[PDB]
Design an enzyme around this catalytic site. Structure first.
Site: not given
Ligand code: HPM
Length: 251
Positions: A17, A130, A148
């Site tokens: 969002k 959560d 997170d």
């Molecule tokens: C779902 O897809 C993903 C989300 C991710 C992701 N998302 C994420 C978003 N936000 C946050 N954090 C925060 O928002 C936050 C806010 C405040 C303080 C600290 C953190 N953390 C992680 N982070 C890291 N790696 C990710 C990988 C993701 O998908 C990986 C796949 O595509 C790779 N694919 C490769 C081939 C076979 C099938 C899989």
């Protein structure tokens, strides 16, 4: 001090969002990571997102092999950027949809990883309330990574004390652990129903049953974790020592 020009941006990993998350790489060293871009104008309207700032402060001081690392963050005039550890294997939720349900070894190994991570958090005064499959990522070796996402949680994973408007503490995490163990083994959550009202009723009354294939040791652990009275739930050390966990964990 980081800068946008330090990275090469790749494909979108997910949408949110307040902004998106992309695969990225540090230009010089070629190091792979994840980058989240948030728009200020969006943050300072959905509320007073000073919440982001508190959450970033908190998250950047947590170092655990089962908790997703926040390497840093920076901003410019219109955007705020979060530099995150990349999870190569994706979400646990996606893995669940493919296999339909996990076997005892996989489930027990996952519950062990989460209890360790939750234990480290509690000692840091960090309580989640959560931890949905959608918010659980997988590392290179298949290890679980807690991210997170709810920094700003449907009924299915909420404990009785909360929907019943009472006061809660770190005991909510034990409840979550029980709901998750069940969903891993059965394929769906224990209180799922056709309506919100019926789900609320089943959680409050703690009404659920197990399919025939679920093992006695598994039933024992889950029945202890899904206790109406928060104080009747075991400590995390008791979960790590439960006979079913010890027998089926691959370590
Ligand atoms: C779902 O897809 C993903 C989300 C991710 C992701 N998302 C994420 C978003 N936000 C946050 N954090 C925060 O928002 C936050 C806010 C405040 C303080 C600290 C953190 N953390 C992680 N982070 C890291 N790696 C990710 C990988 C993701 O998908 C990986 C796949 O595509 C790779 N694919 C490769 C081939 C076979 C099938 C899989």
């Amino acid at each position: 001090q980081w800068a946008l020009e330090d990275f090469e941006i790749g494909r979108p990993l997910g949408k949110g969002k307040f902004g998106n998350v992309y695969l990225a790489r540090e230009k010089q060293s070629k190091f792979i990571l994840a980058l989240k871009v948030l728009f200020k104008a969006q943050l300072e309207k959905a509320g007073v997102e000073h919440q982001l700032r508190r959450e970033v402060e908190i998250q950047s001081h947590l170092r655990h092999p089962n908790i997703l690392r926040l390497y840093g963050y920076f901003h410019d005039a219109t955007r705020v950027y979060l530099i995150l550890e990349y999870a190569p294997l994706g979400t646990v939720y996606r893995e669940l949809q493919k296999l339909s349900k996990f076997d005892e070894q996989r489930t027990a190994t996952y519950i062990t990883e989460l209890a360790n991570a939750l234990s480290y958090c509690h000692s840091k005064r960090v309580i989640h309330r959560d931890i949905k499959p959608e918010n659980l990522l997988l590392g290179s070796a298949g290890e679980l990574k807690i991210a997170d996402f709810g920094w700003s949680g449907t009924l299915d994973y909420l404990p009785p004390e909360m929907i019943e408007g009472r006061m809660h503490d770190e005991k909510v995490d034990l409840w979550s652990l029980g709901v998750l163990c069940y969903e891993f083994l059965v394929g769906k959550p224990p209180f799922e129903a056709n309506t919100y009202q019926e789900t609320y009723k089943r959680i409050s009354r703690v009404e659920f049953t197990f399919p025939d294939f679920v093992t006695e040791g598994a039933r024992d652990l889950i029945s202890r974790l899904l206790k109406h009275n928060p104080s009747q739930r075991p400590m995390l050390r008791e979960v790590l020592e439960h006979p079913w966990i010890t027998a089926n964990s691959s370590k």
